[PDB]
Design a protein around this ligand. Structure first.
Ligand SMILES: [Zn+2]
Ligand SMILES: [Zn+2]
Ligand SMILES: [Zn+2]
Ligand SMILES: [Zn+2]
Lengths: 206, 206, 206, 206
């Protein structure tokens, strides 16, 4: 539970996201809850040139470490932590299927029972606002009130969970649900869904 | 034909499924026929942290080993074994193309002659029922009466065969047929099929 | 130009086809022109368990080596060699995009100038006939009269060239053209094409 | 800033392009600004057989080194350098999504805010002209006047930037935008876009 271990895990999560096809280029950012704020990836540096010392600490007031530049999207990581006290890790990426659904501005409905992993019968899509702004942060905090993941219109995905391993797992599951949704929407609209009654049973079972 | 070899093979099949793109996250479960019951993967543990000792024995009465938690979908593995005496291995996964077809609730018709690998002129789609229930098990046992693989509505795929190698091979072939089906359904509906007469010739040749 | 080198190359081509995503399971078969007949992969054996001694010699009369079982599709390899004297290697696979186009029973028209690599302004699609039959062989020999590659209705692809390296390269290029065709056909039908006059210029330049 | 280092980087960029799924077969060509002309990949040689000595120097007059054959598409690399003085590296490939959009002859509109990486609110599509001709070069020089990347009708993509690392990164980002565009166009046409006012804010922020 010390900084160098948590930074190591952040880096490993970045690399694994790229392995899984969820992150291309420099698009993702990952953070963990730490002391009074968080540890987050820096802006600009390619994932594969990332060393432990590159990880940035931002306190609870938004002041970041001396000599480092945090991800340009750090504000919605801090909004996630303040909106969901149980969240200890946040994964953000621009995964292609999730992002295509965000362009249509649709929520993902209950086309598969694994949608319950995010907390309910849907994956919401928060309205567009310029990256890095307060307005974006507010939409995100509202979307995560009762869901562990949300799409961001014309942008990508945010997933949060109790640790990095589970946050990555959820993010990967939402990209699969997005891919299922787009593949079936091309054939039929609307796509068959499971009823609220059936999702209620699955949620209890989880 | 001893437990440690069979457990080793189960684990290798899990890893290979992930290699092939058939399994994401923690979704699949694999089993083999053993003594009076079966050996199956455990619930929860990520595939890459799986060791031989993690594999769970469930007898013919449904009693599982002390100190282990079997896959939460073990009941339809036991239903497969009871419905098909010739089956010695069962692979279950949530492969994306198969699962998208299961959302449409369609059987895969004979769009390619390799559909005969599963025993007939189609890959059926068994109706939805909550995972882990007796109701689900019954649909699966009925769908496998005359087929070696079946889709499961809003869920995924089950394939069974004489050994793990062949069961994985079949599962991969059904995911390819599913992908062929979705790709052509987006262009034309209905999709051209081979006649029953032609499938009858291919079945004899196999 | 001895047997063990050519067998080594066949095996390497099988492995590389799988690397490229052109071959799944046990579907492909590869051959090279040799002495009075050909060297071809065997039936059944998985690509990764293939050793030099597994490669099968079939003479010009169709008699195969003692103790080995040649690919079950060897007849259309022999038809390719007899129809195209310049062909020294044949690659056959069930690549997913090519096969989806073969299900629609469409030729691939000149949607990109690389279609000229196969010899003209199209990739034909030969009519369906049961695998391994004389009827299939005849369609293939007719389709390859003026083209180096052909789709096979409800089945897959055959590509031939002066050596294995070029035959694999062509097969991969046709799978890309197939993918381009399906992706654009989902959006608009018919798909824009280059005129015959423009393909004529590209053919001269190659 | 010597030739052997720059050639090494060109080769590494070729290999990485193939790693990323942007380049299949022998289709791409990469160059860097050097002395009075450029260093470019040769024609024909497969990427994996490329050694430092294979890289070709072409001066500012179009004269290439003795004993080497430059890429057959070198003219539009030289046109890019003359049209954009700030460009120091050029990546060209036939990436499948970009190329499918080029077949439709559509520009990619602002469906995601990362479109601003190429300089504006769109990725243009330059009209078709035979590869290697002066006519093609002219369309490319006009398309790159106010954009760092362009699609080429019925052909592929060109991206330019201050160094190879950034040029590859841009090329990969445009392939993602192309994939986003095709995936959403199959569902709805036209696809929702961000307004010019919103792209103007994102451009300032970058
Ligand atoms: Zn973002
Ligand atoms: Zn399941
Ligand atoms: Zn075949
Ligand atoms: Zn080109």
């Amino acid at each position: 539970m010390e900084r160098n271990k948590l930074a190591r895990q952040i880096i490993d999560t970045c690399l694994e996201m790229t392995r899984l096809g969820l992150n291309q280029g420099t698009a993702g950012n990952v953070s963990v809850r730490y002391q009074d704020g968080m540890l987050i990836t820096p802006t600009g540096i390619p994932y594969e040139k990332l060393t432990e010392s590159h990880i940035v600490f931002i306190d609870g007031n938004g002041k970041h470490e001396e000599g480092k530049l945090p991800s340009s999207e750090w504000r919605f990581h801090m909004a996630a932590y303040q909106s969901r006290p149980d969240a200890n890790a946040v994964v953000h990426n621009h995964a292609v299927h999730c992002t295509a659904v965000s362009i249509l501005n649709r929520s993902i409905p209950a086309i598969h029972f694994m949608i319950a992993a995010a907390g309910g019968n849907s994956i919401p899509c928060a309205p567009y606002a310029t990256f890095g702004t307060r307005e974006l942060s507010e939409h995100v905090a509202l979307a995560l009130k009762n869901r562990k993941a949300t799409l961001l219109q014309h942008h990508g995905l945010i997933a949060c969970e109790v640790n990095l391993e589970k946050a990555l797992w959820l993010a990967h599951e939402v990209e699969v649900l997005a891919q299922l949704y787009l593949t079936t929407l091309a054939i039929t609209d609307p796509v068959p869904v499971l009823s609220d009654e059936e999702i209620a049973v699955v949620l209890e079972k989880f």
